[PDB]
Design a protein around this ligand. Structure first.
Ligand SMILES: Nc1nc2c(ncn2[C@@H]2O[C@H](COP(=O)(O)OP(=O)(O)OP(=O)(O)O)[C@@H](O)[C@H]2O)c(=O)[nH]1
Ligand SMILES: Nc1nc2c(ncn2[C@@H]2O[C@H](COP(=O)(O)OP(=O)(O)OP(=O)(O)O)[C@@H](O)[C@H]2O)c(=O)[nH]1
Ligand SMILES: Nc1nc2c(ncn2[C@@H]2O[C@H](COP(=O)(O)OP(=O)(O)OP(=O)(O)O)[C@@H](O)[C@H]2O)c(=O)[nH]1
Ligand SMILES: Nc1nc2c(ncn2[C@@H]2O[C@H](COP(=O)(O)O)[C@@H](O)[C@H]2O)c(=O)[nH]1
Ligand SMILES: Nc1nc2c(ncn2[C@@H]2O[C@H](COP(=O)(O)O)[C@@H](O)[C@H]2O)c(=O)[nH]1
Ligand SMILES: Nc1nc2c(ncn2[C@@H]2O[C@H](COP(=O)(O)O)[C@@H](O)[C@H]2O)c(=O)[nH]1
Lengths: 474, 474, 474
């Protein structure tokens, strides 16, 4: 990557320390930018959801796959749960999203708690598989928590058969009191819902799909136990990409695990991490990993820097690892440290094929965690780290190891008061990346990497401009 | 521009990172400094008001033109509105400012709301074109909001015929209860008002005038649609300077727009932006632009740095672009990032012929926005960015593009509790620039650029000294 | 009035010290109660608006007359203003209320300020006398204060010809976004508006009308100057009832004023006050007053009790004065001390034919005072006393008398956040009085007075029950 003349600092750089210098551009519109990655992950946007149980959820898997990203299922997850998640995700419609379905015999408290699992803001009441009404927080207020859904269902809603183009669906929702359109199967049963903004996103985003046309989903493996058997089980479960994830990827056990997984001829892209050095990246690639995850410390839930002093500023680690990987024909993923879309844009300009986002997406409706409200009624979700699940492996022995494992760091991730869904965060990230590409003058991510000119700034340089509003960032 | 020996940082510098080293000076008095620019814009002070609808107003146009600056009317403004604004501004007196005129049949609420549109603090009551009394917030308090002006007009005020020198007008207002002197036409009709400080400013500031002696006013054009026709219409409307404004000035569409506008032989200075690179500046100049606006990111309403990572510290961008422009005989304008008069002084020392100021002037009475009061009764005005108006261009399509445009960032710009007018901000800026010139030893802005010696400081270096009081800065 | 056995306190009683004992009742429904008074004032509800400039307004006059009450115009008001108010009030429709009319050339600030002068919450935009749209606070938010009404008018609204019954109008407003129905004249011009609740109130309340069928309005005279000439001028102005109002009604000047007014054979009911004694009531009646206002001290703006020690608990004064008046065939009005509808009910049970309400109605949209918002954005209106206007009458002399006049007491009357109109207060008062009549067993106010059984309670007795919500009371 090219830097400005004289911009050779005596220290490693974070995303806060660097900026993109605009160049001559033929890309006028942001829609002219192709955001598809070339690392073999199949994502049409450079966003990858981290393999953390607080963020990598089933609903998030479906949503991110529909919007073009991929979700790495967290490691040590039961094979039955992984198989169920893959079966559900790969059965989802490419355009129509799955709503919250309630039977009329359900309770009002159950409806209210289930309502916030999606960004639609309304839940479809179905009887015998056919939609009956919409449950909304407006009609659930002031109602007994254990009344039946029959007493709160709203009999009016917009219907359209599945397969209708987003144009008419957007037109139908022009003056609908509820912004949710209930898509119906040709036999009349519920096929899903299409939000007014969901139609636009379907027109804009191309879903990340496998060879069979189903939504892509990834899974993660630890290096504890028989890594080969776990990788084989995850491959047979339907995972389209395997991630070997460890806190310290540049270690002998990681190389052995990569060799074991790569020796099975599994036919899937191999992701290994994390390393922050060129030597670690080259060792991981030579072990058999096609993609090398980058970043030790910048994770928002990571306490390695404060507890151990071990780490590296994410931007410099990503540039070094990307240079090392593309020297050998591999790719890298920027993992951790993503707070703003500028972080994604700089990671892509740094040479990363994909950017892994963790705790930022935890503050979304689609996150597996339960939505919580603080004393000010501001919605939030708890984000927690993988902790021992990312480490290398009688109650006495359990407590003995547990005395030294890193604690589970917990943080409050406030939801956007109006745009709390993960689709809105994806919109912000993709719009920022497309703006970066237009400023650089690139129609695709590889052109963004080759054509980018970067500079170094001080704290005052980062302080320039308007901060993003609350909810738009982590 | 010359830097101190060894001051070659490995990063780009903002205004916060640089300081001016005093040199041998023959300029003892600040009034000995000539602040007139040499870029062809005709401004007698280096202050230019940004083409933002929140700041670039009709009253601000008149005031800034009278005080020697110029105001760029925001782009996409209707041609009828632009023509009306130019006709009003160019009909204003060079010395006497236009007051708030109220008929005796007007309401008290209307008088109170209109009172804060000017910095005078009093509104002239006129009957049949002749002044009758002064409406002041003091006499509007405790009065029914829909009483007539007749019940609140103050029958006493200082009168003087138009053309009287500022000396006698200042003498007449020595002990007047209201600091406003009502200037009258030779036939007795109202010709305007001359504030006690307005007389001093008229004695100090030389208005920016065109060949016909009328106040100068500028207009802006976007690069969407037929740029040539819009430039022709703005030229026929009476604009003395045309600004081609885009978020990314270093793009093919911008070069085409500059070529189209410059091919009309319009006979006006051409301003294009924004770029932060020497290549962009040279390309814009070769396209036909006499002046190149500089700055992508430092705008207070700009979220490009946080959303996209694209940007550049304003001082380094300005020095590079000014060197590139004066290498080809052109000029540059420093756009955005101006919070204190030191920013203007450093931009001028950096090589910028003019400095463009945006959201800072939004917190003034003359700003087109309505004056607002927070919970603490502190006056403020809302400043908002151009957003899609600075970008490159069925409700479905409108929402589809609108999903990716940068949001309209809004900020609170508190007015100075005692000096809320834009004339006071101009006084602070011009006094700071004159002090910088005296410290350097220069009697004019070009001498300021050639003779300046600059240094680099850390955060502690910027922390030295006394911060400016509230209202004096953005 | 009959009291409970043994309930003979050694002190005078307020409304707080007494309660109504329910009796055998044949009145099952509250609509079976006839609230019409028999004092000759012509009011169909026992509510009279006090002659205070803070409450007795033109809009309040129209509204209260339409709902069946009467409004006494404050004394010392100019005869031209009184004539204009009477002409406007008597030209109002008996069913359709006058809206806030805005021309399309009006400003947004003017529309917003005028919007709260009525309880409709919407203002009708009229061009050439024909309605065009509705201005609402929803569409006035975020708009420039001096934009034209054209930019904020809402093109949709419910129309119905004048004379349509309230049934269809209520049906038409079943799902209208704005609760205002624009009534049109047969030629298409605006005839007024009919609020959804206004239709119900028209079906419930019978307007107080004179012999010619126009809305009734009263006026007040002080005892300073030529009282006879002022009474004659007010009678020719169209007032249907004259009130001779003084702080101390039991004085020689008051008797002379009553004799002078009653000697003109004006043909209108005569109201004189205030007295709190049987002797004062009998003297006022023998002087020529048909109705005697009762109460010295209980007025919310009255400081006589605290400043002078002179006063009387309102309930005992009302019972004594009512007994004295009906001993001579006269009537009394309970003036002051009305905070809750229970005060009106007890005053009626005490023998008062009508109840005069002052500062309580000042916290309404129809009040002549301007609507104000405190630091918590809670709407309120300032209520102030008559002060010297209720008393007995060179700047030195003016200051000499002014040194001894009672100060103008000012209080904050918070508006009901949802029911800020005076029609809602009238609804509460009338519903409470009807409930009292049903509990007593009376179909009319005279039967309420004869059939009521009252008791005495301590502070704990008053503390029993649920307090009324905010806005429902003073
Ligand atoms: N009636 C009803 N129950 C639901 C619905 N979605 C989920 N549930 C129930 O709630 C449980 C938790 O829901 P989810 O959190 O979406 O399920 P999950 O498999 O844990 O998915 P993630 O948290 O996204 O990883 C499910 O196991 C169901 O029992 C719905 O639409 N309707
Ligand atoms: N009576 C009266 N009305 C005024 C006066 N100045 C402005 N107005 C009215 O208020 C409206 C808004 O005023 P301005 O904001 O100064 O006008 P503008 O053309 O929008 O100018 P900018 O906001 O400075 O761009 C005008 O269109 C007039 O209708 C004045 O002195 N007297
Ligand atoms: N455009 C317009 N102006 C109005 C309207 N109502 C009142 N005004 C104006 O505002 C002034 C004050 O209104 P009001 O307070 O209702 O008039 P008022 O005669 O003082 O009546 P009260 O305060 O009720 O005693 C009037 O003199 C008019 O100039 C309306 O509907 N439209
Ligand atoms: N050391 C450590 N890293 C973690 C933990 N949880 C998440 N991470 C790392 O941080 C990344 C997410 O960073 P984020 O996007 O939340 O800033 C994950 O993909 C993973 O690499 C943890 O408990 N410990
Ligand atoms: N990208 C961007 N730049 C803006 C916007 N509004 C204003 N600007 C830039 O910021 C300048 C003003 O900066 P300020 O003086 O307010 O710090 C303008 O002249 C323009 O160049 C906006 O919405 N987006
Ligand atoms: N003494 C005195 N009485 C007043 C004043 N203002 C109003 N009042 C009395 O108080 C009555 C209204 O009482 P309220 O209903 O506000 O409690 C009026 O009708 C009048 O009799 C004032 O300034 N002084």
């Amino acid at each position: 990557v090219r830097f400005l003349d004289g911009h050779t600092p005596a220290y490693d750089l974070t995303y806060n320390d660097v900026f993109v210098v605009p160049g001559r551009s033929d890309v006028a519109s942001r829609f002219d930018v192709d955001l598809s990655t070339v690392d073999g992950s199949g994502t049409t946007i450079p966003v990858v959801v981290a393999n953390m149980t607080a963020v990598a959820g089933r609903r998030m898997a479906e949503t991110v796959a529909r919007r073009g990203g991929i979700v790495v299922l967290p490691q040590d997850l039961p094979i039955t749960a992984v198989s169920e998640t893959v079966d559900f995700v790969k059965s989802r419609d490419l355009v129509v999203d799955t709503p919250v379905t309630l039977s009329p015999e359900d309770s009002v408290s159950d409806a209210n708690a289930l309502l916030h699992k999606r960004a639609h803001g309304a839940a479809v009441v179905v009887f015998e598989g056919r939609p009956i009404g919409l449950v909304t927080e407006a009609n659930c207020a002031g109602v007994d928590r254990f009344a039946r859904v029959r007493d709160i269902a709203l009999s009016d809603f917009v219907t359209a058969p599945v397969g209708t183009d987003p144009r008419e669906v957007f037109d139908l929702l022009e003056h609908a009191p509820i912004d949710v359109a209930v898509m119906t199967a040709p036999d009349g049963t519920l096929a899903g819902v299409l939000t007014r903004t969901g139609a636009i996103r379907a027109g804009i985003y191309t879903p990340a799909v496998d060879a069979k046309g189903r939504l892509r989903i990834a899974a993660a493996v630890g290096i504890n136990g028989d890594v080969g058997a776990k990788a084989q089980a995850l491959a047979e479960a339907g995972a389209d990409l395997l991630v070997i994830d460890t806190a310290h990827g540049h270690q002998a056990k990681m190389l052995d695990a990569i060799k074991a997984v790569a020796s099975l001829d599994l036919g899937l892209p191999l992701v290994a991490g994390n390393v922050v050095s060129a030597e670690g990246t080259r060792d991981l690639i030579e072990a058999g990993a096609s993609i090398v995850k980058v970043g030790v410390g910048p994770g928002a839930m990571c306490t390695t820097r404060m507890m151990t002093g071990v780490g590296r500023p994410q931007f410099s680690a990503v540039v070094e690892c990307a240079a090392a990987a593309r020297q050998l024909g591999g790719h890298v993923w920027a993992d951790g440290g993503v707070r703003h879309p500028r972080d994604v844009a700089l990671a892509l300009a740094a040479g990363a094929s994909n950017v892994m986002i963790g705790s930022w997406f935890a503050g979304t409706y689609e996150s597996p965690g339960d939505l919580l409200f603080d004393r000010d009624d501001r919605p939030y979700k708890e984000s927690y780290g993988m902790a021992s699940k990312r480490a290398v492996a009688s109650s006495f022995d359990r407590a003995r190891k547990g005395l030294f494992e890193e604690g589970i760091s917990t943080s409050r991730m406030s939801l956007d008061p109006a745009r709390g869904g993960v689709e809105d965060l994806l919109d912000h990230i993709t719009s920022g990346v497309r703006s970066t590409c237009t400023y650089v003058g690139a129609a695709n991510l590889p052109e963004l990497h080759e054509k980018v000119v970067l500079g170094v700034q001080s704290a005052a340089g980062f302080a320039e401009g308007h901060p993003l509003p609350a909810g738009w960032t982590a």
